[PDB]
Design a protein around this ligand. Structure first.
Ligand SMILES: O=C(O)C(=O)CC(=O)c1c(Cl)cccc1Cl
Ligand SMILES: [Mg+2]
Ligand SMILES: [Mg+2]
Ligand SMILES: [Mg+2]
Length: 716
């Protein structure tokens, strides 16, 4: 019909044309050979892909039955452990080893700093994310609640000097704490100059140098009256901008205009849980943005050039202006009708993403005609985050998929590197083996704690009612999971070789709380962690200036801080855990978050949205937070905590409020009062009522079906 025949495959024409006219030119890959390879790789690897998914279902069925045949309230951990080993869930731990991944860029092997994740289908957001390698600290402090909006310090239509002076003082303390002077405080500086290759800071009664002059990295403008001074601390750059005639500079004792922080060191361009892509048209929209980013010519606003500096001694150098880009492919579960076979069966989407995003990534290995030939990877790697894997065999399948794609693309073996999400229970408890199976490709491990919480609930669905969603974040199993991840990475030699990463801060407006609390992640040895915005990347960067992550990792070496038993502690709620009002709060909490996210997913194809929780906190929602919410309500329904009328009432209670939050979005179609005429409302209900029967609690089967249903109704 609208499809192209290649071997056993029938490729949607819009995808075929995109690859041929846009992605292949410039790669020197013969098109006929590429498409033949697509057919061959799909033909060869689809059977094992399916067997792996069938094995998940078989393991879950056995675990479900294990719980159903037992009465004893305290789970006998010795028996449970023996059972998981019996059925092949818990595998033997391999001998100690060190990863051998080579050809990785310094932003990954060495630098500790924030990692930003952004939906690749939004070109404006993706551009801003790539440019977020540098960000204004003054803008992040002035614009967020990190500076409280106390009396006199509020934001207004125009600049509030009381507030600005607080921003200035906050940043002076940061400089004092990060790049200390030999004597005195940056707060009292009157000027900066460069003399004999040394930074000299003028104070009211004297001048001083840096306590550690090696932290002076360079400057711009004349040495005797610079326009900026560049410092480095824990491998991250700080730039003091000097302009006494600027709007902020005129108020500053040294004429300082701003403090620029190296912020988003790396960025993950997401094809997975933060985007809605259910057919070839949606996939091409995302592939084309990924292509623009790797060619440097994406424009919505354009991509930044590298930054030019004068060295202390007076030579010239440059620093990268863009964040180093990963791409998050989808995982092993879903198919997509962008390609179907001769039976009409859809092709696995993860296989397609490896082929198409790897092809497109070749452009990021060569000079771009649109900015000073910036190469995403100078060392020659393609960085793919692979989510939602369950255990070492699934990691091995990813490595073999990448190997076969490298052959189709004519790339050297192991060009395609893997950032492993540790976000499913069966990977958590076999993590050493998972790393070993990717020992020559792995570039990070990351605790995707929200997916991991959803898997936790689904895996033990039959055991009993789980604690409330907010309680999960502090349960024994998750704290052990976080420490176990760091322990495994460090023991595999990640320090100096690969990132050890932690999860996303989702409260996009609570930046004071983020700055107060997220420091725990670098303090735990994580060399990176996820932020939702360029502004949050700049603010999270502060933590890497306060915490010497490299020293932390060095002091953690050899420690074994989590046992298998701690990892397997199921978050079952205690008897009589909740009052009636607390149960209704949690139902309303989850139903509002589900509805607010799903309505924009199904009706507008938006895969990540800010949705208020029960306490009015704006939360960046994506599929993982939806997985938790729907699995938790499904678990409470499964065990008699709530009735199906409680669920219906809550969904109908919260639905008009969600309509109110989205009012007038032109393309907004209200759910109330005719709930069962709304495909989005029905999707939300189905996610809860079918949640116990979704494989590992994944939300994509229902979301994809319902989004496609919406698109089909709109077309007629
Ligand atoms: O926790 C894991 O499972 C993740 O993988 C996290 C994730 O996607 C995400 C993103 Cl990028 C933005 C907003 C909210 C979340 Cl939850
Ligand atoms: Mg069953
Ligand atoms: Mg995840
Ligand atoms: Mg230090």
């Amino acid at each position: 019909t609208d499809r192209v025949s290649v071997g056993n495959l029938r490729i949607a024409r819009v995808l075929y044309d995109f690859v041929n006219n846009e992605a292949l030119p410039g790669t020197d890959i013969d098109p006929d050979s590429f498409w033949a390879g697509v057919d061959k790789v799909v033909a060869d690897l689809t059977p094992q892909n399916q067997a792996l998914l069938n094995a998940r279902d078989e393991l879950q069925a056995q675990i479900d039955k294990w719980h159903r045949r037992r009465v004893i309230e305290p789970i006998d951990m010795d028996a449970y452990r023996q059972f998981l080993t019996e059925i092949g869930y818990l595998l033997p731990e391999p001998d100690d080893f060190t990863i051998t991944t080579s050809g990785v860029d310094a932003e990954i092997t060495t630098t500790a700093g924030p990692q930003l994740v952004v939906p690749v289908l939004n070109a404006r957001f993706a551009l801003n994310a790539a440019n977020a390698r540098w960000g204004s600290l003054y803008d992040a402090l002035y614009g967020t609640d990190v500076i409280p909006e106390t009396d006199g310090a509020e934001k207004g239509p125009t600049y509030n000097k009381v507030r600005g002076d607080k921003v200035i003082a906050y940043a002076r303390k940061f400089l004092d704490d990060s790049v200390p002077l030999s004597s005195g405080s940056f707060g009292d500086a009157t000027g900066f100059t460069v003399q004999d290759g040394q930074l000299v800071v003028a104070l009211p009664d004297k001048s001083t140098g840096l306590a550690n002059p090696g932290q002076f990295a360079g400057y711009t403008g004349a040495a005797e009256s610079p326009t900026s001074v560049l410092l480095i601390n824990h491998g991250l750059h700080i730039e003091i901008l000097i302009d006494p005639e600027s709007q902020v500079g005129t108020t500053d004792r040294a004429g300082v205009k701003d403090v620029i922080l190296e912020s988003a060191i790396t960025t993950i361009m997401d094809f997975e849980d933060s985007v809605a892509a259910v057919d070839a048209a949606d996939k091409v929209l995302g592939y084309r943005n990924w292509l623009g980013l790797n060619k440097g010519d994406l424009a919505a606003r354009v991509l930044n050039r590298d930054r030019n500096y004068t060295a202390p001694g007076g030579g010239q150098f440059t620093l990268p202006g863009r964040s180093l880009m990963f791409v998050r492919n989808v995982g092993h579960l879903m198919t997509n009708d962008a390609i179907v076979d001769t039976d009409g069966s859809e092709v696995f989407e993860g296989i397609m993403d490896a082929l198409f995003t790897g092809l497109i990534a070749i452009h990021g290995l060569k000079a771009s005609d649109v900015n000073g030939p910036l190469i995403n990877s100078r060392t020659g790697s393609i960085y793919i985050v692979k989510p939602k894997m369950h255990g070492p065999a699934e990691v091995a399948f990813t490595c073999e998929l990448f190997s076969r794609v490298e052959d189709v693309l004519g790339l050297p073996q192991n060009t395609m590197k893997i950032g492993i999400m540790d976000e499913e229970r069966r990977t958590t408890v076999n993590l050493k083996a998972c790393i070993k199976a990717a020992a020559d490709r792995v570039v990070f491990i990351n605790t995707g704690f929200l997916d991991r919480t959803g898997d936790e609930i689904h895996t033990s669905m039959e055991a009993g009612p789980m604690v409330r969603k907010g309680t999960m974040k502090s349960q024994p199993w998750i704290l052990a999971y976080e420490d176990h991840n760091v322990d495994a990475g460090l023991a595999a030699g990640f320090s100096g070789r690969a990132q050890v990463g932690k999860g996303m801060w989702t409260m996009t407006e609570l930046m004071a709380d983020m700055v107060e609390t997220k420091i725990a992640q670098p303090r735990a040895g994580a060399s990176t962690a996820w932020v939702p915005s360029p502004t949050a990347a700049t603010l999270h960067a502060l933590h890497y200036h306060q915490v010497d992550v490299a020293a932390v990792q060095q002091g953690l070496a050899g420690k074994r801080r989590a046992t298998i038993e701690q990892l397997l502690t199921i978050p079952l709620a205690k008897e009589l855990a909740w009052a009636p009002d607390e149960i209704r709060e949690e139902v309303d909490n989850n139903c509002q978050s589900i509805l607010g996210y799903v309505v924009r997913w199904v009706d507008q194809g938006v895969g990540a949205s800010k949705v208020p929780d029960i306490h009015d906190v704006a939360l960046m929602e994506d599929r993982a937070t939806l997985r938790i919410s729907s699995q938790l309500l499904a678990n409470w329904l499964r065990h008699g905590v709530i009735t199906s009328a409680d669920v219906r009432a809550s969904l109908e209670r919260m639905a008009p409020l969600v309509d109110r939050q989205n009012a007038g979005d032109v393309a907004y179609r209200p759910m109330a009062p005719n709930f069962d005429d709304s495909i989005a409302f029905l999707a939300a209900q189905e996610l809860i009522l079918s949640g116990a029967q979704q494989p590992n609690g994944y939300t994509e089967p229902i979301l994809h079906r319902r989004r496609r249903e919406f698109k089909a109704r709109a077309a007629e």
